[PDB]
């Protein structure tokens with residue numbers, strides 16, 4: 171039952187001290203690269219974007235994966251939507267800006283900026299090579315710790331129209347809160363071909379996770395302890411284990427913590443009351459997350475949390491057989507009392 175899930179979470183709590191030291195190994199490399207990129211004309215206004223829990227600047231995507239986001243303040247920015255994709259945009263300017271070396275008429279080239287960014291990193295990684303670190307931009311600190319670095323364009327302007335019906339937290343976190351979060355900046359990340367940038371809102375996650383209840387006092391006292399974070403921790407861990415178990419057959423390579431997070435938060439909108447997340451119902455709640463995620467896998471529909479018209483589970487992004495492989499693996503883990511959590 172819930173007892174089994176609790177022992178998994180307690181096991182995960184002890185490995186938190188090893189990924190706090192690993193977060194430090196990542197922070198040293200990132201601070202070294204930041205003062206290196208800041209001396210450059212193009213990356214003069216480069217800064218670190220705080221997205222997670224460790225130092226705020228470092229995030230976690232898998233047992234050894236780390237996510238770092240380098241922001242770049244881009245004032246006087248005009249966005250042009252690409253072929254009604256709702257998430258992808260061309261970057262255009264409204265004077266003598268430092269970003270001028272990557273322009274092609276009016277369109278700011280993503281590949282041209284990511285080339286200079288990647289080269290400076292590849293250059294200082296060989297400079298301070300007395301700390302084992304090798305190669306959007308992925309590094310590997312001491313044959314174990316993997317770190318994915320992302321160059322983001324910060325826009326302090328209002329969120330584009332595609333987001334209007336996104337962040338449906340009004341009935342959970344409130345309308346007052348949605349308005350305040352929508353006052354925060356948004357980020358543009360190069361696309362994974364065209365010179366387009368994708369809307370990123372990863373920085374908003376830390377805001378909601380540390381203030382996740384309908385009640386302001388959620389998880390501040392024993393009498394109001396919910397199982398929201400625990401369901402996300404268990405949903406994330408389930409995929410990490412499945413990805414490790416089938417790293418041999420490549421079908422789970424496209425699926426990430428991002429898909430697990432999106433689906434979990436959609437269940438938060440679905441279940442806005444803290445009573446729908448009681449700590450005694452850990453098993454029941456985790457299953458509702460598993461069921462919605464399996465419904466997403468089967469229907470080939472997982473909506474971006476900030477852009478409803480953008481499908482993360484589109485045939486274009488992830489193939490149907492990759493989705494059916496995860497559907498049958500999870501369905502099995504559900505029908506075998508989760509043996510991937512065996513200890």
Ligand SMILES: Cc1cc(Cl)c(-c2cc(C(=O)O)c3[nH]cnc3c2)cc1F
Nearest residue numbers: 369370371372374375428431432435475
């Ligand atoms: C409630 C909520 C839910 C989600 Cl899913 C995200 C979020 C968004 C992006 C993004 O690119 O837009 C992510 N990219 C990597 N992890 C990400 C997490 C932020 C939130 F505030």
Ligand SMILES: [Zn+2]
Nearest residue numbers: 383388389396
């Ligand atoms: Zn809570």
